[PDB]
């Protein structure tokens, strides 16, 4: 498919000027062979583990936001 935006549009701009990210040949494939296999066999468990890590990170950061005010 034609990529009208950049291959990494979040990094396309710095301040008000452009950056050197473009689809000169195309967008790289970022799905390793092991991961795509894992995303269908035992795939449903990885989503729960991914969400739990986010929840644990949220709980830890909130505690640091509490400690760093008292410190």
């Amino acid at each position: 498919a034609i990529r009208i935006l950049g291959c990494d549009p979040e990094l396309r701009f710095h301040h008000g000027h452009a950056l050197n990210i473009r689809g000169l040949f195309g967008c790289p494939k970022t799905t390793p062979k092991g991961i795509v296999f894992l995303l269908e066999r035992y795939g449903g468990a990885t989503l729960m583990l991914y969400l739990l890590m986010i929840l644990l990170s949220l709980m830890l950061t909130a505690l640091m936001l509490y400690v760093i005010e008292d410190l």
């Binding site: 498919a1 034609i2 990529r3 009208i4 935006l5 549009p9 701009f13 301040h15 008000g16 000027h17 452009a18 473009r22 689809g23 000169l24 040949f25 195309g26």
Partner: protein
Amino acid sequence: PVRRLLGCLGSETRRLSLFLVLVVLSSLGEMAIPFFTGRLTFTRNLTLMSILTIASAVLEFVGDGIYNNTMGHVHSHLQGEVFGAVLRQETEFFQQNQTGNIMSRVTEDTSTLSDSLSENLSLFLWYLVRGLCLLGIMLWGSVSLTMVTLITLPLLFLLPKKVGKWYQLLEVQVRESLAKSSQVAIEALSAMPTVRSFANEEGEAQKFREKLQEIKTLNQKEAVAYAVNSWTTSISGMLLKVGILYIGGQLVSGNLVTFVLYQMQFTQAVEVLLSIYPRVQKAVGSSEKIFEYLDRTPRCPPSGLLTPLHLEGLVQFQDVSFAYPNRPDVLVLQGLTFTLRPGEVTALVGPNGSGKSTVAALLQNLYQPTGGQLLLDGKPLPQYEHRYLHRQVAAVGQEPQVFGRSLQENIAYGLTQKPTMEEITAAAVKSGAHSFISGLPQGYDTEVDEAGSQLSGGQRQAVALARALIRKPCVLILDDATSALDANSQLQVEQLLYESPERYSRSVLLITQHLSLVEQADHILFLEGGAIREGGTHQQLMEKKGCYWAMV
């Protein structure tokens, strides 16, 4: 409110239009590579992709140069006009607003707005043209589903529209809190010898920290607002894509793939566009004060257009009463009625706080009387041209300010054309300042520090007297000037007041709460409680009441 911002940029639309045609041409060359090249098997792909890459690089280089050059003109124009509008305000405006508060608005608030405008405008145009190109491809895939996407699109505007008002009031409080801290800093730094003398260094630092704490409280809410905004735009964009996929799945039209492959790209452009609106609202709040200055109408009357070739120094007050706008219900002056004539010296005497310096302020047209009228040569002061009026009327303040430049520039300050050194030397000789200025290592080229801190206590009045004399003024005001002068300077002052042949071109108002020089005055006016209680010559006042209660 938004139209007030972009109204200034509309003065240079031609430059931006040239920028717009370059970016769209550069975009077309960049999208040409995926459309035309196969990167397989071959030379045909390599040469055209090399040429188009150079063309894209060159076109965007020229476009960025025009954009940066145009933004520089807008910034310098906006910052210049904000400062020009500040100086047009009334004298009360600079008592309501401190000098550190005003300078923060002119220097930092204006630069924040243009900096914000610079980054967002280029990003907005870039995503607008690609969004249109992505939309056009989607129209080819499916007319019906694009209309459904466009119909439900305005619903996504609702939530950023709510956050936008949060950004406005949040930014306004941040800007004014920084102004408060700036005033605290510059007020202490401008009076370090007093702060050091009273050991209040840590008292000033603590007073400064109380302002940073207010900023810290607002900065905490700004960080939460960013995360809320970043969550809503990304989540809402996902639902728009998923909702269409559900409709697409319910419609299985086997060619829906070509519409989906670019619909997933259109939502990424909308996601970026929805993030622009909160920062646009931030810029609106970041510039409330500077736009308030630019459209506020000053309290002063407009300057008139009268420039007589020759003017007499006939100044007459007629039932003048005045009250400062800070306390408009308390009258500082009551029913003043006296006349100044050329060739005569009038002495104004009174206790501290009697209103003498207020009389001088009215004569210099710094304030308007609340009653009666004040006339110069038969015409009201506002009827004269601004620069013309301040050449005929000159004054020496109770504590004259001295600007941080050379002595010759201080003496010749405010004159339309630079006088020759022969004129400056004559003025310095006439005021007695030549006795000490010539002794400086660099003479008239010596740079003086802020507020004239380098000069001695009594020498500052001598330099200020020279500044007033060089105008060849018609009315001369001496507010407490003669107290600290040397014996040599005092002889010069009483020579120019009572002896010099140039007296007949001047009318002099002499203000002093001491009897040092009022004996030779042609008329003496005693001011107490804002009203003139006694008047007459020196001998007449002696016979009026025994020992006068002010000299024995």
